[PDB]
Design an enzyme around this catalytic site. Structure first.
Site, PDB file in Angstrom:
ATOM      1  N   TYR A 142      29.529 -39.729  -6.986  1.00  0.00           N
ATOM      2  CA  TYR A 142      30.495 -40.268  -8.074  1.00  0.00           C
ATOM      3  C   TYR A 142      30.312 -39.380  -9.200  1.00  0.00           C
ATOM      4  O   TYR A 142      29.530 -38.847  -9.659  1.00  0.00           O
ATOM      5  CB  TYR A 142      30.072 -41.573  -7.896  1.00  0.00           C
ATOM      6  CG  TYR A 142      30.168 -42.593  -6.840  1.00  0.00           C
ATOM      7  CD1 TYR A 142      31.400 -42.954  -6.308  1.00  0.00           C
ATOM      8  CD2 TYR A 142      28.947 -43.055  -6.326  1.00  0.00           C
ATOM      9  CE1 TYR A 142      31.420 -43.868  -5.295  1.00  0.00           C
ATOM     10  CE2 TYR A 142      29.400 -43.891  -5.050  1.00  0.00           C
ATOM     11  CZ  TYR A 142      30.723 -44.142  -4.600  1.00  0.00           C
ATOM     12  OH  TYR A 142      30.765 -44.842  -3.677  1.00  0.00           O
TER      13      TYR A 142
ATOM     14  N   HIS B 133      34.168 -39.708  -7.818  1.00  0.00           N
ATOM     15  CA  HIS B 133      35.391 -38.834  -6.837  1.00  0.00           C
ATOM     16  C   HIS B 133      36.690 -39.575  -6.446  1.00  0.00           C
ATOM     17  O   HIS B 133      36.806 -40.540  -6.961  1.00  0.00           O
ATOM     18  CB  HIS B 133      34.559 -38.779  -5.387  1.00  0.00           C
ATOM     19  CG  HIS B 133      34.329 -39.913  -4.368  1.00  0.00           C
ATOM     20  ND1 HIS B 133      33.292 -40.653  -4.362  1.00  0.00           N
ATOM     21  CD2 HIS B 133      35.341 -40.663  -3.933  1.00  0.00           C
ATOM     22  CE1 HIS B 133      33.743 -41.753  -3.629  1.00  0.00           C
ATOM     23  NE2 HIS B 133      34.965 -41.772  -3.270  1.00  0.00           N
TER      24      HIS B 133
ATOM     25  N   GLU C 165      37.172 -43.044  -8.446  1.00  0.00           N
ATOM     26  CA  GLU C 165      36.259 -44.206  -8.551  1.00  0.00           C
ATOM     27  C   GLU C 165      35.017 -43.961  -8.901  1.00  0.00           C
ATOM     28  O   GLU C 165      34.423 -42.754  -8.494  1.00  0.00           O
ATOM     29  CB  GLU C 165      36.201 -45.103  -7.028  1.00  0.00           C
ATOM     30  CG  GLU C 165      35.594 -44.037  -5.854  1.00  0.00           C
ATOM     31  CD  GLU C 165      35.211 -45.052  -4.786  1.00  0.00           C
ATOM     32  OE1 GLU C 165      34.576 -45.868  -5.043  1.00  0.00           O
ATOM     33  OE2 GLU C 165      36.019 -44.599  -3.647  1.00  0.00           O
TER      34      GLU C 165
ATOM     35  N   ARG D 196      33.646 -51.130  -8.559  1.00  0.00           N
ATOM     36  CA  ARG D 196      34.137 -49.778  -9.066  1.00  0.00           C
ATOM     37  C   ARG D 196      34.959 -50.012 -10.009  1.00  0.00           C
ATOM     38  O   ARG D 196      35.959 -50.935 -10.115  1.00  0.00           O
ATOM     39  CB  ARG D 196      34.837 -49.155  -7.945  1.00  0.00           C
ATOM     40  CG  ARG D 196      33.786 -48.916  -6.656  1.00  0.00           C
ATOM     41  CD  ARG D 196      32.674 -47.955  -6.561  1.00  0.00           C
ATOM     42  NE  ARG D 196      32.051 -47.788  -5.489  1.00  0.00           N
ATOM     43  CZ  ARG D 196      30.837 -48.380  -5.143  1.00  0.00           C
ATOM     44  NH1 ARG D 196      30.558 -49.270  -5.991  1.00  0.00           N
ATOM     45  NH2 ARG D 196      30.384 -48.198  -3.920  1.00  0.00           N
TER      46      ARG D 196
ATOM     47  N   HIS E 184      33.991 -54.207  -2.981  1.00  0.00           N
ATOM     48  CA  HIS E 184      33.857 -54.401  -1.451  1.00  0.00           C
ATOM     49  C   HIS E 184      33.362 -55.841  -1.066  1.00  0.00           C
ATOM     50  O   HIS E 184      33.590 -56.230   0.074  1.00  0.00           O
ATOM     51  CB  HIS E 184      32.664 -53.520  -0.960  1.00  0.00           C
ATOM     52  CG  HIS E 184      32.847 -52.108  -1.017  1.00  0.00           C
ATOM     53  ND1 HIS E 184      34.161 -51.568  -0.187  1.00  0.00           N
ATOM     54  CD2 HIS E 184      32.432 -50.946  -1.234  1.00  0.00           C
ATOM     55  CE1 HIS E 184      34.110 -50.296  -0.398  1.00  0.00           C
ATOM     56  NE2 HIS E 184      33.143 -49.972  -1.035  1.00  0.00           N
TER      57      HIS E 184
ATOM     58  N   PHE F  15      38.453 -52.381   0.137  1.00  0.00           N
ATOM     59  CA  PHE F  15      38.083 -52.970  -1.254  1.00  0.00           C
ATOM     60  C   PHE F  15      39.501 -53.997  -1.467  1.00  0.00           C
ATOM     61  O   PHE F  15      40.376 -54.067  -0.751  1.00  0.00           O
ATOM     62  CB  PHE F  15      38.577 -51.662  -2.321  1.00  0.00           C
ATOM     63  CG  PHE F  15      37.681 -50.874  -2.479  1.00  0.00           C
ATOM     64  CD1 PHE F  15      36.339 -50.948  -3.321  1.00  0.00           C
ATOM     65  CD2 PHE F  15      37.486 -49.549  -1.829  1.00  0.00           C
ATOM     66  CE1 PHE F  15      35.286 -50.149  -3.466  1.00  0.00           C
ATOM     67  CE2 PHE F  15      36.470 -48.628  -2.204  1.00  0.00           C
ATOM     68  CZ  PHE F  15      35.492 -48.936  -2.904  1.00  0.00           C
TER      69      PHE F  15
END
Ligand SMILES: Nc1nc2c(ncn2[C@@H]2O[C@H](CO)[C@@H](O)[C@H]2OP(=O)(O)O)c(=O)[nH]1
Ligand SMILES: [Ca+2]
Ligand SMILES: [Ca+2]
Length: 104
Positions: free
Chosen positions: A38, A40, A58, A77, A92, A100
């Site tokens: 992250y 990414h 994110e 996120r 999630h 998501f």
């Protein structure tokens, strides 16, 4: 009151700005943290109706208020773009598998 609610997690705009600032800075320096690398690119497989332009990236936002620095990313996120604009806050939590759903 919460500006964003991801499942049971309550976030204020200051929370999202702080998270976004850390992820965006790493993005600019071309660096990543954590096993999932992250921040990414976020492809928007879900088809969310983002008002700002792509590319999207994110970055984990933690319920503890702490800035992500590598371990378990959790379920939440923040999604930001190339112009440092917030595209949305997703999770999630309440979603099947690795899908998501948007935080409300
Ligand atoms: N669900 C989902 N995963 C995405 C998206 N863009 C990139 N990914 C990545 O695609 C793979 C399948 O979900 C994962 O590696 C996931 O990364 P994260 O697991 O780091 O979110 C997206 O738009 N939706
Ligand atoms: Ca907070
Ligand atoms: Ca703390």
């Amino acid at each position: 009151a919460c500006d964003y609610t991801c499942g049971s997690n309550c976030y204020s705009s200051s929370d999202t700005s702080t998270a976004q600032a850390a992820g965006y800075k790493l993005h600019e320096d071309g660096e990543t943290v954590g096993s999932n690398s992250y921040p990414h690119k976020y492809n928007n497989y879900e088809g969310f109706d983002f008002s700002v332009s792509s590319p999207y990236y994110e970055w984990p936002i933690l319920s503890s208020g702490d800035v992500y620095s590598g371990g378990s990313p959790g379920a939440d996120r923040v999604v930001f773009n190339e112009n440092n604009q917030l595209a949305g806050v997703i999770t999630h939590t309440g979603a099947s598998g690795n899908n998501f759903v948007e935080c409300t």
